[PDB]
Design a protein around this nucleic acid. Structure first.
Ligand SMILES: [Mg+2]
Ligand SMILES: [Mg+2]
Ligand SMILES: [Mg+2]
Ligand SMILES: [Mg+2]
Ligand SMILES: [Mg+2]
Ligand SMILES: [Mg+2]
Ligand SMILES: [Mg+2]
Ligand SMILES: [Mg+2]
Ligand SMILES: [Mg+2]
Ligand SMILES: [Mg+2]
Ligand SMILES: [Mg+2]
Ligand SMILES: [Mg+2]
Ligand SMILES: [Mg+2]
Ligand SMILES: [Mg+2]
Ligand SMILES: [Mg+2]
Ligand SMILES: [Mg+2]
Ligand SMILES: [Mg+2]
Ligand SMILES: [Mg+2]
Ligand SMILES: [Mg+2]
Ligand SMILES: [Mg+2]
Ligand SMILES: [Mg+2]
Ligand SMILES: [Mg+2]
Ligand SMILES: [Mg+2]
Ligand SMILES: [Mg+2]
Lengths: 53, 187, 225, 128, 147, 125
RNA sequence: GGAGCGUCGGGCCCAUACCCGGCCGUCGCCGGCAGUCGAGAGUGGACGGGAGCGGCGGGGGCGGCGCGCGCGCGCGCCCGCCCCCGGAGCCCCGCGGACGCUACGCCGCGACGAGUAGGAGGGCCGCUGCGGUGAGCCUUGAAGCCUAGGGCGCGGGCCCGGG
RNA sequence: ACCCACCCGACCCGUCUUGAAACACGGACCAAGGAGUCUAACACGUGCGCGAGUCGGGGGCUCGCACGAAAGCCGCCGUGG
RNA sequence: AGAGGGCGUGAAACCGUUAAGAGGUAAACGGGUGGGGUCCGCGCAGUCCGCCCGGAGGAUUCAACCCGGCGGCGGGUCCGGCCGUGUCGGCGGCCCGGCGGAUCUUUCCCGCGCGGGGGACCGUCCCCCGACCGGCGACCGGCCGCCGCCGGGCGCAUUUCCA
């Protein structure tokens, strides 16, 4: 029951969202994995530019 | 039994600043002493406006400071603001100033020190004029916040100009029944 | 330099002492003049009555301009208009007393709050007990005892009332400073009447203690003070 | 002779009995520690005649004699010898209190150091 | 900090700050924004006017790329260009008249709010306001279109 | 300066001691051991401290030098007074009086000095 | 010959009610204190000339704008000094200025103190874990538990003594 | 503070209620567990930084991660809100 | 084993025994006391001392005052030098300084109308002596006043400890 001058809100939490929460605790380890893969690619192509063509 | 209405026996004014910042507390101590010793009301107003909150001391703009200090009679005068001095980029020329404030932004400070003015703090203002002689005490726009556009008389009501709390403005979120004479009624 | 400052300090102390003795002599002579005026009034009322009785006449005395009002019923179960008039007359507790000057508005206010008060016309010795024994003034909104004439001389120095005798003379012979004197006087916190009340709930005519005690208020003042 | 305080006031106490909790006489699970009654119909809450009394602010002891021992001192809990020089300028009004967890080996050192510094200990003859 | 929340000061209080007569039930007036035309009608009239009804046309595939038109006023016009450009002004016996490229700064339409200082300009913008053009030609500048 | 670091130190110092309603302060050169702005020797430009001697006989008096801040090794100077105790009280009194060296600590340092004097003697029978 | 009824007179009994006094807390004081003479408050002092027991020739007003605990006081000899408080020695020290000052502290007056549903504030009340801190405590005895012991706090609870 | 004796007071706590000691309901006693939490959207008030600007989201560069999946930085310091 | 094979500590409800008290208005509670117990703090008088002063018993040294050395505080014409800020002078560093610019020059160079490096211009940060205002708690070396410490001269009406 809305009362005494708030916003007329529409929250999208009517589905089963707690089963589908995507927590992002992976992402600093994912930055480490992307860094290691990028350094491995740069060591693979040794005279070539590391970014690409 | 005595019939005192005890609803308003406790005055709800500020006695001390709610913040825990030690430079502001030292300025508060110095203006406490100046308020309960000096006979001037300037130190009391400075202490009362050092008591207030951040949304209660509004930022004062540089062009309004130029406007209020180019009034006649206040030559050789200083401008004491108990909030912050913010720069306006839409003013071109700036004269010599003597500005006392809690905090001046970097662009306004560079503009005043390039124009040749002086920027004092409150301890330097107390060392210069302890009774507050040669001062004009200014304050920024109090009703200038967006929060006051939603206050006062309620919307959905005739002769009211209150901004309603809308999550996103547009065509189909409002301006229908309650705002159109075609859809039932307008106000 | 130092001897000059010493002689200057002794001169200032002598100036304060001489001015204090002059104000003391002022208070003494004004109290003597008030004694003379009181004896004059008490003589001339009997003179008027005797010269009225000498012929076939009658001296109707004046309705006295000053009354003393005591709230005799407490705060529980009070009408709104009656409570408003009692808090305008500064009767907030049971057994409070105030000096009230008499006019049409005052008589009508007292007659519409008759059943909760006992009011009468007091006497000079009644004013003397109520001001010397119960002397409480309102200085900086504080109920401060009147242990010195300097308090009245600081509070009402711009009204001509600078001592206890000036205050008693204004209250008894109501003049142009009765409003300031009555606003200075805190409403008197009197004790319970020693010897018991006759009846609180009914009027003094029908055997009670409420209403108009226009001459018999002095015995109740002696019992409550 | 013993260690005398600086001034010896007459310690007056408005109430020396304990504010026990309601129905702690009846029930064992109800401790003696005070809990305020908050019921709609409670004798103790609405203060009927001849019952247990509620702890109000009116039972407050005098500020000159608050937290004061019957000897005339105020307690200060002391763990070691270094904490005894804290009360070096307060021995006429404050007294040392050796903690429970302090061993009997250094308790004698604390007692003799307080005897050298003229500081009263309320429990010197405990362990030995 | 649950140390400073309200549920610590309500230990011992029975109804926990939610009333003894009317208890804190689960959903007394419906879930969410329930009852638009009914039993919340006074709230939805005196605090959200225009909430019910259709108005205006419908533009189905709308995109902000076509309607992106950022606006700058003449009161903040010398802010987009560095300060030495207006230091080196009213000099050189020429009428130097610097160029202010507005699309380079990031705006498309130049509006006419505010006072403009007396210095000729060449304002290059995609769109202009009529009042802005009147202020620029009154100072002595020139409005140049660009696409 | 001094009031600034007092506003820092006044509640979150390591030498502060609560526990049973008295707030003391246990740093060196804090005579009377109060957590006050008068009785704090770490902060101020001028500092008087009174301590017992390490040998057991005499009283050492610690004077802050003023000749260098940011240098705690040479910030203080220590002297040792072992005399007939009237000259001890008079010497410390002259130290704090004639040198104009913060006279608020004067009589309290006399108190602490003569209490150390009564400490360094056989107390019982 | 009421301990009944009706009209009454003295004395007497007490409630958390009223008066006075003691204590606690709340609120108010343009509250006082970073250090001074000052209580109806209506000044101090260099600096040039004449020089003086004379001094401002103002309301039976009953009084403040003014007088006799000195203003030329005293000493050396008509003239000069009329001196500093490392100390005039004083109810006030304009010479630095606490025992009283965790200024988020201390202190001084005045009024008030009921309470459900509810709201706010302070907890040096209590539990658990963490970052700092106590040259912290401890097998010369930690936590826990019992106690007909000593206590403190209005209270939540806490500190010791014994096993 | 343990027990007993006397005088006066004194009906059993919580709840629904206009009204509870109730012939209204729950309740033998004791120990442990036990009930206003977390995310998002807002609104208002407060604390802080900057100020017609503000924020770095996301990503990238440095340390091999004890402390770390911390911290620091960015012609990305503004794509974007 | 006062840890004895479901055994670390072993609470409450409940039960048994011992000791004490009591008992016909069910038990229990609040206020005020009284009595009896278990323990605590004294005490063969606890009158507790902390200063100053007088007297009769004692006593080692030193203070009062000078000499030599060391350390500290305060400061003058600011004594001389560093240091330090506000202005003026050499626009001197500007190339024997980097950065940034939406101010010009492609009078230039390189990689091919563009990008970078040059050249002036502006803004931001520095070098040398001299003056004034605050010498500013950012430092010294001399000089003066004062204080403290060490070693001697200081023989006893001074000086300090026990009773
Ligand atoms: Mg890529
Ligand atoms: Mg109330
Ligand atoms: Mg209220
Ligand atoms: Mg009634
Ligand atoms: Mg009820
Ligand atoms: Mg409640
Ligand atoms: Mg409920
Ligand atoms: Mg609620
Ligand atoms: Mg409800
Ligand atoms: Mg119901
Ligand atoms: Mg109800
Ligand atoms: Mg019913
Ligand atoms: Mg009930
Ligand atoms: Mg029934
Ligand atoms: Mg039911
Ligand atoms: Mg049942
Ligand atoms: Mg539990
Ligand atoms: Mg809301
Ligand atoms: Mg906010
Ligand atoms: Mg958006
Ligand atoms: Mg075992
Ligand atoms: Mg085990
Ligand atoms: Mg084990
Ligand atoms: Mg076992």
């Amino acid at each position: 029951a809305p009362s005494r001058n708030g916003m007329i809100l529409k929250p999208h939490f009517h589905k089963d969202w707690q089963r589908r929460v995507a927590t992002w605790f992976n992402q600093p380890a994912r930055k480490i994995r992307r860094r290691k893969a990028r350094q491995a690619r740069a060591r693979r192509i040794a005279p070539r530019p590391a970014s690409g063509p | 039994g005595v019939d005192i209405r005890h609803n308003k026996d406790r005055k709800v004014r500020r006695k001390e600043p709610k913040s825990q910042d030690i430079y502001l507390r030292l300025l508060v101590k110095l203006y406490r002493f100046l308020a309960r010793r000096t006979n001037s009301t300037f130190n009391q107003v400075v202490l009362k406006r050092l008591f207030m909150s951040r949304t209660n001391r509004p930022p004062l703009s540089l062009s309004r400071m130029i406007r209020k200090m180019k009034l006649p009679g206040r030559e050789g005068k200083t401008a004491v603001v108990v909030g912050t001095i913010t720069d306006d980029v839409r003013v071109q020329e700036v004269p010599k100033l003597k500005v006392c404030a809690l905090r001046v932004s970097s662009r306004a400070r560079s503009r005043i020190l390039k124009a040749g003015g002086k920027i004092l703090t409150f301890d330097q203002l107390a060392l210069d004029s302890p009774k507050g002689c040669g001062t004009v005490l200014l304050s920024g726009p109090r009703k200038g916040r967006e929060v006051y556009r939603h206050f006062g008389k309620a919307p959905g009501t005739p002769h009211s100009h209150t901004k309603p709390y809308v999550r996103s403005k547009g065509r189909k979120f409002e301006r229908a029944r309650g705002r159109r004479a075609s859809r039932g009624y307008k106000n | 330099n130092f001897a000059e400052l010493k002689i200057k300090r002794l001169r200032k102390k002598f100036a304060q002492k001489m001015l204090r003795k002059a104000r003391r002599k002022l208070i003494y002579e004004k109290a003597k003049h008030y004694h003379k005026e009181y004896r004059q009034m008490y003589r001339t009322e009997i003179r008027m009555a005797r010269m009225a009785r000498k012929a076939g006449n009658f001296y109707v005395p004046a309705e006295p301009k000053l009354a003393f009002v005591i709230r005799i019923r407490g705060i529980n179960g009070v009408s709104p208009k009656v409570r408003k008039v009692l808090q305008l007359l500064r009767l907030r507790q049971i057994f409070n007393g105030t000096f009230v000057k008499l006019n049409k508005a005052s008589i009508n206010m007292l007659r519409i709050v008759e059943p909760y008060i006992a009011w009468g016309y007091p006497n000079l010795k009644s004013v003397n007990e109520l001001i010397y024994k119960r002397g409480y003034g309102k200085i900086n909104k504080k109920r401060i005892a009147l242990t010195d004439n300097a308090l009245i001389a600081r509070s009402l120095g711009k009204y001509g009332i600078i001592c206890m005798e000036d205050l008693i003379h204004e209250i008894y012979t109501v003049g142009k400073r009765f409003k300031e004197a009555n606003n200075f006087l805190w409403p008197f916190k009197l004790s319970s009447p020693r010897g018991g009340m006759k009846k609180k709930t009914t009027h003094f005519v029908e055997g009670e203690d409420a209403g108009n005690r226009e001459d018999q208020i002095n015995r109740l003042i002696r019992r409550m003070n | 002779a013993a260690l005398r305080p600086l001034v010896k006031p007459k310690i007056v106490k408005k109430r020396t009995k304990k504010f026990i909790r309601h129905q702690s006489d009846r029930y064992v699970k109800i401790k003696r520690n005070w809990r305020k009654p908050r019921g709609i119909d409670n004798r103790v809450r609405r203060r009927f005649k001849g019952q247990i009394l509620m702890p109000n602010i009116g039972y407050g002891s005098n500020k000159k004699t608050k937290h004061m021992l019957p000897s005339g001192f105020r307690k200060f809990l002391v763990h070691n010898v270094k904490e005894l020089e804290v009360l070096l300028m307060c021995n006429k009004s404050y007294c040392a209190e050796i903690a429970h967890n302090v061993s009997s080996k250094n308790r004698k050192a604390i007692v003799e150091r307080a005897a050298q510094l003229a500081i009263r200990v309320t429990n010197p003859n405990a362990r030995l | 900090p649950s140390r400073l929340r309200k549920t610590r000061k309500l230990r011992g209080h029975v109804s926990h700050g939610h009333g003894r007569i009317g208890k804190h039930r689960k959903h007394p007036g419906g879930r969410g924004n329930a009852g638009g035309m009914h039993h919340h009608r006074i709230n939805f009239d005196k605090y959200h006017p225009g909430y019910f009804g259709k108005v205006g046309m419908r533009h189905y595939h709308l995109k902000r790329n076509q309607s992106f038109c950022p606006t700058v006023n003449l009161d903040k016009l010398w802010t987009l260009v560095s300060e030495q450009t207006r230091v080196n002004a009213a000099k050189n016996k020429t009428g130097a008249a610097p160029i202010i490229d507005v699309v380079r700064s990031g705006y498309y339409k130049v509006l006419g709010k505010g006072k403009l200082p007396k210095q000729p300009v060449i304002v290059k913008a995609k769109f202009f306001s009529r009042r802005a053009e009147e202020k620029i030609k009154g100072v002595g500048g020139a409005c140049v279109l660009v696409a | 300066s001094a009031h600034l670091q007092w506003m820092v130190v006044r509640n979150c110092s390591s030498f502060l001691i609560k526990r049973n309603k008295q707030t003391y302060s246990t740093e060196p050169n804090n005579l009377k051991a109060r957590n006050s702005f008068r009785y704090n020797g770490l902060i101020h430009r001028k500092t008087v401290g009174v301590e017992p001697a390490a040998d057991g006989k005499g009283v050492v008096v610690v004077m802050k030098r003023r000749s260098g801040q940011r240098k705690p090794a040479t910030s203080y100077v220590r002297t040792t007074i072992n005399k007939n105790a009237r000259a001890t009280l008079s010497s410390i009194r002259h130290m704090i009086r004639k040198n104009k060296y913060h006279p608020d600590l004067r009589m309290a340092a006399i108190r602490r000095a003569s209490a150390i004097l009564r400490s360094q003697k056989p107390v019982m029978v």
